[PDB]
């Protein structure tokens, strides 16, 4: 809160969701150190590339942390698959790539650690070919993707070769990730993802601005679980730096006045007044396929109670279908009505995720609202 | 917050010569007006006490357009002053500017006079006012500004003014839309359709 941030080199979000205990934290720390040297839980570090300013999100690679990882990847603009070159693909890596494809991460860069732990020039190529084949078979891009090999912990050790290699890694990261599209057309909207309580400052809510801008001193409305209320913003900041306005697409922390830590939970949205209204039941078309798209095999019936993940959080919901469909067997391209317990401010065209038993069943697009 | 809504039902709730709408469209006892005959028409439960006093207060308030709190303030001022509390209260009610306009004729109805006073169709001593609660003093003059001259609003009101009788204290010329208010009325000139000491008893309760 002592640095006046300059809105140059537009913000781009990059997230590392690589394999567990394969060097994600070490890799991001090494990247930050080498960039700050040559240029002068979800860990949100930042670094200013000469091309663009990036915010690096090291997400937890644990399966049980998938719920917050969903927002971390939806938050994310470019994925970094961090994997060891001595073990190759893993079930955890496959789950992570499936989640990334289901959340819609366009650009992914593969990094191969433990390059020097292997005294050969064929095993590294074999594992690179294997991961490339995995990407090409799991609906991912192919030979037009920069694949990065090298050591993630020696990048911090005194060297020159690996420093140059990681600098080249950062270069094509910023090359392969062009200027992203921002949605500052509609009024301001920001889904909440974390809450902090600053002693002497107050409560601050973190998140990626979905749309619109936030000027210092603007009135906004909290809409979400069990509550729709009003508030005032004072002191827009980003990564402990002074800001003047907050564009859309970057993870920022907005300071709210008259906010209670227990009263405000994750799942709500800070919108412009009179824009969106929370609803508990709405009509949506489902896009489940027969068997090979996450959906189950046996022809289940009504009363299904899945979690409907949204931009922020999820909630257990019920589904009702119009007459003409005796069963709700997988293969549901039809429209139905979904009722949720916790009301969340929603708009037409919203894309949500249907999940159950730790696996995604199908997608859904909001068609109408029944309040 | 001036009262707004039905008026014939409001009048027939009590049943009196409170006052009527300025326009007339078959104003008579056609079939059911205030004492509805035929198969029903229970008009008065005949309440023992304090009920007639409440009805008198309500009819007084709805005639003059004043609210309960302001009416009670006027009653307190009248009790604080000398003379009789009821006549002092009636004097304040008539000194309210809207009733002055209505009795001068520029207001077709009392609600219309309040509307004009709010819309600045009235001026006092060569000064605009947009308060229907202003109290006029004796020996004063109240004029109508040039903008309100061209109102079919006022033309109809002045036409209807001369069908009634005229008061002891107002002298108005329509060649200039100006009226002199000389003295304050008394119970003798005021209509004897209500009792004042019952109202005095009620709020002294």
């Amino acid at each position: 809160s002592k640095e006046k941030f300059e809105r140059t080199k537009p913000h781009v979000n990059v997230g590392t969701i690589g394999h567990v205990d394969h060097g994600k934290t070490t890799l991001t720390a090494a990247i930050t150190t080498v960039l700050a040297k040559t240029y002068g839980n979800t860990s949100h570090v930042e670094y200013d590339t000469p091309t663009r300013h990036y915010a690096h999100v090291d997400c937890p690679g644990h399966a049980d942390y998938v719920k917050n990882m969903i927002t971390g990847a939806a938050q994310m603009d470019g994925a970094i698959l961090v994997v060891a070159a001595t073990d190759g693909p893993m079930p955890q890596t496959r789950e992570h790539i499936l989640l990334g494809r289901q959340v819609g991460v366009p650009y992914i860069i593969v990094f191969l650690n433990k390059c020097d732990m292997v005294d050969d020039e064929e095993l590294l190529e074999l594992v690179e070919m294997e991961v490339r084949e995995l990407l090409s078979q799991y609906d991912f891009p192919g030979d037009d993707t920069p694949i990065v090999r090298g050591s993630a912990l020696k990048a911090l050790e005194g060297d020159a070769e690996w420093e140059a290699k990681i600098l080249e890694l950062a270069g094509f990261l910023d090359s392969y990730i062009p200027e992203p599209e921002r949605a500052i057309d509609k009024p301001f909207l920001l889904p909440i993802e974390d809450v902090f309580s600053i002693s002497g400052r107050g409560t601050v809510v973190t998140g990626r601005v979905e749309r619109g801008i936030i000027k210092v001193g603007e009135e906004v409305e909290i809409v979400g679980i069990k509550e729709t209320q009003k508030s005032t913003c004072t002191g827009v900041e980003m990564f402990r730096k002074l800001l003047d306005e907050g564009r859309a697409g970057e993870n920022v922390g907005v300071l709210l006045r008259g906010i209670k830590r227990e009263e405000i939970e994750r799942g709500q949205v800070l919108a412009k007044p009179g824009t969106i209204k929370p609803h508990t039941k709405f009509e949506s078309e489902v896009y489940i396929l027969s068997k090979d798209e996450g959906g189950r095999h046996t022809p289940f019936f009504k009363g299904y109670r899945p979690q409907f993940y949204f931009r922020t959080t999820d909630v257990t919901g019920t589904i009702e279908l119009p007459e003409g469909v005796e069963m709700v067997m997988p293969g549901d391209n039809i429209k139905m009505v979904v009722t949720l317990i916790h009301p969340i401010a929603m708009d037409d065209g919203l894309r949500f995720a249907i999940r159950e038993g730790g696996r995604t069943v199908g997608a859904g697009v909001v068609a109408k609202v029944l309040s | 917050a001036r009262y707004l809504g039905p008026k014939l039902k409001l009048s027939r709730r009590e049943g009196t010569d409170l006052f009527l709408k300025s326009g007339v469209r078959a104003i008579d006892t056609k079939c059911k007006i205030e004492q509805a005959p035929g198969q029903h028409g229970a008009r008065k439960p005949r309440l023992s006490d304090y009920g007639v006093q409440l009805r008198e207060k309500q009819k007084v308030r709805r005639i003059y357009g004043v609210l309960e709190r302001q009416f009670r303030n006027y009653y307190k001022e009248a009790a604080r002053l000398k003379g009789n509390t009821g006549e002092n209260l009636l004097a304040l009610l008539e000194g309210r500017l809207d009733n002055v306009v209505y009795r001068m004729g520029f207001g077709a109805t009392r609600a219309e006079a309040r509307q004009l006073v709010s819309h600045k169709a009235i001026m006092v001593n060569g000064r605009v006012v947009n308060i229907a609660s202003y109290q006029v003093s004796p020996n004063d003059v109240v004029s109508i500004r040039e903008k309100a001259k061209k109102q079919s609003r006022v033309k109809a009101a002045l036409e209807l003014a001369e069908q009634r009788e005229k008061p002891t204290w107002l002298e108005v010329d329509a060649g200039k839309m100006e009226g002199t208010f000389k003295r304050k009325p008394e119970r003798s000139d005021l209509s004897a359709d209500i009792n004042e000491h019952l109202i005095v008893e009620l709020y002294s309760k």
Partner: protein, 146 residues
């Protein structure tokens, strides 16, 4: 024993049998412990062999903090075919009204110990009715006051 003190002090029970009832998971798992509110269960004629009526669900803290579990939910009595039409006829022309009395357990089923009680007559209100008539007459006779 859930003796239903109301049905004990008034219109002693005369006939009963043993049967369970149908219920969902919300209004269950507390009758196993014993907490319930079955005082003067108003069981009336239902087409489904006189579905259980009157008695509500226990106020134990099994609530989803919205309702207890079910402010009004269907409860079914159990009888193959012995008392639908006979119960209707008895209520119509005998004076015997079947009510639920206790909740005994086979250690698994919360049994509806419904008892066929006699309809007892109301207390003689022939004094309070006249008191009310005199009160309304007094309220009406206040006319001659001005």
């Amino acid at each position: 024993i859930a003796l239903n003190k109301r049905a004990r002090h008034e219109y002693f029970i005369e006939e009963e049998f043993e049967a369970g009832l149908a219920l969902q998971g919300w209004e269950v798992k507390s009758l196993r412990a014993g907490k319930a509110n079955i005082s003067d269960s108003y069981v009336l004629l239902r087409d489904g062999e006189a579905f259980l009526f009157g008695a509500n669900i226990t106020p134990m803290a099994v609530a989803s903090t919205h309702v207890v579990c079910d402010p009004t939910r269907t409860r079914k009595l159990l009888l193959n075919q012995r008392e639908l039409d006979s119960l209707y006829g008895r209520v119509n022309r005998e004076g015997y009204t079947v009510v639920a009395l206790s909740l005994y357990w086979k250690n698994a089923w919360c049994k509806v110990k419904i008892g066929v009680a006699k309809g007892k007559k109301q207390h003689d209100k022939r004094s309070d009715i006249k008191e009310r008539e005199w009160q309304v007459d007094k309220a009406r006779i206040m006319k001659n006051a001005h």
